[PDB]
Amino acid sequence: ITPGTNTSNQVAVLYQGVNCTEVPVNVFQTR
């Protein structure tokens, strides 16, 4: 999830259908 590269180079990562307590291979929890 990113804005345009003309704006910034900062991104966010969404792991689909993954509980955060088991995320590894801020932190918010969504549906």
Add this chain to the structure above:
Amino acid sequence: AARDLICAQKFNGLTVLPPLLTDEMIAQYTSALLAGTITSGWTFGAGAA
């Protein structure tokens, strides 16, 4: 002991993304439309209520 068959699709890579609007948001839209229709007839579709 029994696979629910959603797990087979998930293990083979067939997933389902959630909808953007929740059922609470859909119910809020229907409540807003219903309350506007009851209170103001048809004028809220044109201008203000």
